[PDB]
């Protein structure tokens, strides 16, 4: 029963409440216990409680005396219990409660008036119960109640009388999910004082019942309406007619298996701002299908269209000018679809669009013709996502229409070509370009000469070729900050590849083959490709096969903080190499061949660190080579994980395995 300010007793197998806790405890948690009964006599000591979570237990019934000992209680949680009986005195003395959870209590019927005696209640939960009617009392109470949950019940109708108790209550959420409701009575929602949101997830309504619901929702203050998994197979221009008289802003139609969308179906939602259509089965989207939605600010179409079938090849076709009505659209999530391709008028009309995601949106977008994004000429796009589209070729002037583009995501594709440099024309405001996980890329002298504003360039596992050209391909990128060149099997790097990149901060070169470039036997001398990077912060050189470190590689990294050198073949290091690393924070040298750690090389490096990884190193336990290192280990504040588990000497056999 650990407790400093709140009390936790979760999964402690308690049968009775403890009697030794501070008097001024505010939270008392007893989830996942076996409290058969909860006598109130044990609560005399605990008279300062605010939250009382006694859920996931086996309490049969409570007593009103429990509320007497708690004068300031605000939270009462009784999830998954057997409290199937309620009385007027059960919650009589409790009046400051702002939360009441009764989920999965097997409550059958609300008898007379269990919730009259409280007026400050905010949230009430009755999910997973056996209730058949929404009647919670005879008179009107629950003045401040804002959220009411009735999901997973056995309610089959919503009569007007049963909600007469909410004639002056502002309901911000009326959860009625998983209830087989098949009849709606007139005035059922008009009787509610102020209904702001309705949730009917997993409720088998159907199109006609949905229309009846919308008609019953006319001339009310609803703002949200979730109809997820409602078996809404088909919509028409009259399905949402009843919403013409309201100001609905959020509508959810996910998992409804919406086979087709009718013409002018959503013309009755001029105030809609958030529309959801994810995980549907739409086979055809008409030009006027999205008519009347000129105020939507966020549209989701993830898996909204039908998948390909070899039987008929029923690829979901999108008609031209289908998105012309979304004038105020600002976010279009359109991932995991099977569209045949992009047309010249697919995205016409989106004059306020700022985010388009097309991750795996097309079956085969092999070639990015310069006329592909012509429909996005007037769209002020900022972020474009094109991952998992199986793109195989990008022609010149492909992105010449996205003048406002800032982030381009072309990763996780099969792009195999030579970057002539004309593919990036028109990206005057580009900031980040992602190209990782491609087939193979062949850089040229002027590959990135048309995008001087670029700041991020990720090329992880792309099999870079001709990166060792005499003019550095990264020279025009004066504002580059993050560069990733990992898993490219790079062999040759020129010393001037990173020349002029003063603002570079994060550089990744792990999983490459640069061992030869740093050995002293390399013809032409070692390659010092890390000169001039005064602002470099993070360096990654894992699995490079390095066997020798030149003395003056890190001679100018005055602001280096994180350096990675794990999974290498380092055995000896030059003296006085980390002198300029005055602000080093993390040093990684795991899975290396280092046998000696001396102050002459690791002195300045161990000045003020916060992490250290030298686990799988065959250390040599000798006072000439390890005594200083173990002495530094003894007294330090740097975090060294698995210090006593893997920091084991290998030689001599006298100290074989001794930490």
């Amino acid at each position, epitope marked *: 029963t650990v407790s400093h300010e709140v009390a936790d007793c979760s999964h402690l197998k308690l049968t009775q409440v403890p009697d030794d806790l501070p008097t001024n405890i505010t939270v008392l948690n007893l989830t996942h216990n076996q409290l058969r009964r909860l006598p109130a006599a044990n609560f005399t000591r605990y008279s300062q409680l605010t939250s009382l979570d006694v859920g996931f237990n086996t309490i049969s019934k409570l007593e009103p005396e429990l509320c007497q000992k708690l004068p300031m209680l605000k939270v009462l949680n009784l999830q998954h219990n057997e409290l199937s009986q309620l009385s*007027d*005195k059960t919650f009589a003395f409790c009046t400051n409660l702002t939360e009441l959870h009764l989920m999965s209590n097997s409550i059958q019927k609300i008898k007379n*008036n269990p919730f009259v005696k409280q007026k400050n209640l905010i949230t009430l939960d009755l999910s997973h119960n056996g209730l058949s009617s929404t009647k919670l009392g005879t*008179q009107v109470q629950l003045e401040n109640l804002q959220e009411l949950l009735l999901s997973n019940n056995k309610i089959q109708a919503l009569k*007007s009388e049963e909600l007469d*108790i909410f*004639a002056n209550s502002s309901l911000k959420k009326l959860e009625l999910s998983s209830n087989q409701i098949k009849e709606f009575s007139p005035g059922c929602f008009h009787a509610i004082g102020r209904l702001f949101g309705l949730f009917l997830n997993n409720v088998q309504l159907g199109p006609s019942l949905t229309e009846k619901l919308c008609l019953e929702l006319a001339n009310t203050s609803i703002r949200n309406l979730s109809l997820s998994n409602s078996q809404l197979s088909t919509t028409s221009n009259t399905t949402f007619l009843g919403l013409k008289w309201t100001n609905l802003t959020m509508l959810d139609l996910s998992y409804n298996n919406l086979n087709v969308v009718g013409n002018d179906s959503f013309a009755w939602l001029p105030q809609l701002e958030y529309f959801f259509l994810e995980y549907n089965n739409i086979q055809h989207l008409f030009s006027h299908s999205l008519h009347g939605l000129f105020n939507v600010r966020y549209l989701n179409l993830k898996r909204s269209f039908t998948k390909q079938s070899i039987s008929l090849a029923s690829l979901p076709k999108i008609d031209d000018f289908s998105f012309q009505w979304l004038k105020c659209l600002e976010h279009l999530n359109m991932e995991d679809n099977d569209i045949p391709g992009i047309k010249s008028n697919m995205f016409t009309g989106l004059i306020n669009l700022k985010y388009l995601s097309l991750s795996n949106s097309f079956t085969s977008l092999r070639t990015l013709t310069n006329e592909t994004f012509v429909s996005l000429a007037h769209s002020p796009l900022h972020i474009l996502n094109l991952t998992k589209n199986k793109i195989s070729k990008i022609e010149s002037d492909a992105f010449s229409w996205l003048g406002h583009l800032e982030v381009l995501d072309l990763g996780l594709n099969e792009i195999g070509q030579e970057l002539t440099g004309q593919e990036w024309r028109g990206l005057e405001n580009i900031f980040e370009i992602y190209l990782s996980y491609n087939k193979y890329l062949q850089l040229t002298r002027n590959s990135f000469a048309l995008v001087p504003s670029l700041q991020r360039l990720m090329l992880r596992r792309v099999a870079l070729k001709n990166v060792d050209s005499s003019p550095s391909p990264f020279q025009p990128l004066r504002n580059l900050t993050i560069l990733d060149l990992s898993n490219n099997n790079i062999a040759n790097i020129n010393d001037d590849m990173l020349e002029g990149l003063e603002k570079l901060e994060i550089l990744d070169l792990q999983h490459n083959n640069l061992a030869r470039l740093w050995k002293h036997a390399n013809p032409g001398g070692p390659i010092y490709f890390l000169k001039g990077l005064s602002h470099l912060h993070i360096l990654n050189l894992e699995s490079n096969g390095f066997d020798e470190i030149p003395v003056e590689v890190f001679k100018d990294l005055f602001e280096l903080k994180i350096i990675d050198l794990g999974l290498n073949n380092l055995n000896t290091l030059p003296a006085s190499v980390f002198n300029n690393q005055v602000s080093l924070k993390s040093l990684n040298l795991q899975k290396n061949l280092i046998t000696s750690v001396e102050k002459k090389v690791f002195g300045p490096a161990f000045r003020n660190l916060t992490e250290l990884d030298m686990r799988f190193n065959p250390f040599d336990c000798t006072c000439e080579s390890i005594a200083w290192f173990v002495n530094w280990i003894n007294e330090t504040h740097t975090n060294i994980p698995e210090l006593s588990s893997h920091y084991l000497c290998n030689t001599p056999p006298h100290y074989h395995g001794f930490p």
Partner: single-chain antibody
Amino acid sequence: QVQLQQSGPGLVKPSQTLSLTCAISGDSVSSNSAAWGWIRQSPGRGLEWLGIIQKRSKWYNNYAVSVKSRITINPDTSKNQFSLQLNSVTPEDTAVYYCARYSYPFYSIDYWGQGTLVTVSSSVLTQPPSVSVAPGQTARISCSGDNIGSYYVHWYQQKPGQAPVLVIYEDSERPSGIPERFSGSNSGNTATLTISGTQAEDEADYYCSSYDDPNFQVFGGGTKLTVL
């Protein structure tokens, strides 16, 4: 405060309609903080709830199954009244009819009509029938039943020729104006009205009553208290 004035014939021929009117002053018949109802009392029995109506969203009425097929309680919003229409009367309908205000939230009755005696001619709460007490001696009136441990118990006092007076509500609460010597308790399936030092003015009939889920209101048989 609230005045309820009843009016109507005190004599009805059999098989006719018994019509009475309760006129409200100092309150509204459409009030969302009260309910308006009729109960009756014959000397061969105690108190019997007949019907009730309350203005919440639409007009809702609840009737006792004994007279459900005959009774009718309609409000007159234009005149701030409510009526009582009991068809097919029979000398078994001869009784004193009271109109009353049920005060939320306990449905205890704080205001009664003067009562109209009507003659027709051409759950169980159990109380001891009688309790005799000396002046200054504490009186204890018990009330047993299954509603005791499941509902609040109200206690009413009725002097001869007068409407009942609520002396205790919600098993122990005492309305203002009632002497402090009155108190109530509820232990198990037995409620108890204790009159500490019964005075001569406390000699009356005491009825225990409670709310009830199917039948709305249930009254005890009544206990005659005598100050010797």
